Amino acid sequence: KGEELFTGVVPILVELDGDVNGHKFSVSGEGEGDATYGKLTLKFICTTGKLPVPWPTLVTTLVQCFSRYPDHMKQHDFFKSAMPEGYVQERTISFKDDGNYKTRAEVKFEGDTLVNRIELKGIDFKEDGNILGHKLEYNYNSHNVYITADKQKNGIKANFKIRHNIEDGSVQLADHYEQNTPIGDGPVLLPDNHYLSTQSALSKDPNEKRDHMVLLEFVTAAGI
Ligand SMILES: [Mg+2]
């Protein structure tokens, strides 16, 4: 079914257009995914200059179809079942004591490449907060993404809390509320409650002078 499109390495393109408090920026990413291992390897570049928010705050927005679903849980993989026509992911990301991002992403194949096209709008950020003040460490904690079915919208929802490390030892919470809805009208898999366990490693390309992020991520379904 759509899962058949993910048995090997798949090239990935990510394109993001953003506006946070009137700071306009764009990000382009390239890399590949291998759902057999739940593995993503991507490099993202800010093509407009300096990124006006910290890179870690964009990780969740910057392809859950690459999650490794164990064989015994394959009937719960909504993301691949929506392919190749794709799905639309919408999120509200609420930064505790600060502003919010609202995002819309279309995830679909363009020929044999998996594309994630994103619009991000951020409002009500504090000039001197952890986000616009760039007070977040360049690292990333492991988290669970809790998925539930939304049968009346033929899709899924997700809820989860990201904890961003602040440079003083504290934590910036980012509450995520997510909806995913198929683009096509073929049948999709509507899962039982489960989660995705995600681990992410952020690094820099030593030969790259543009503002950028190298990401290695592993995503594995569990909870059934
Ligand atoms: Mg207002």
User: Contact at 8 Å (CB) between 157 and 178?
Assistant: yes
Measured in Å, residue 32 CA sits from the centre of ligand 1 at 39
Query: β-pairing, 100-110 with 10-20?
Result: unpaired
Would you list the domain boundaries of the chain? 1-224
Measured in Å, residue 42 CA sits from the centre of ligand 1 at 35
Annotate 81-95 with b (16+ C-beta within 10 A) or e (fewer): bbbbebbbbebebbb
Cα angle 197-199-204, degrees, rounded to a multiple of 5? 160
The breaks in the chain (C to N more than 2.5 Å) occur after 62
85, 56, 80: which is closest to 67 by C-alpha?
80
Measured in Å, residue 127 CA sits from the centre of ligand 1 at 14
Name the CATH superfamily housing domain 1-224: Green fluorescent protein (2.40.155.10)
Measured in Å, residue 124 CA sits from the centre of ligand 1 at 7
Instruction: Report the 10 Å Cβ neighbour count for 213.
Output: 24
User: Contact at 8 Å (CB) between 6 and 65?
Assistant: yes
Return the biggest CA–CA distance within the chain: 49
Measured in Å, residue 22 CA sits from the centre of ligand 1 at 13
Model resolution, angstroms: 1.2
Experimental technique used?
X-ray
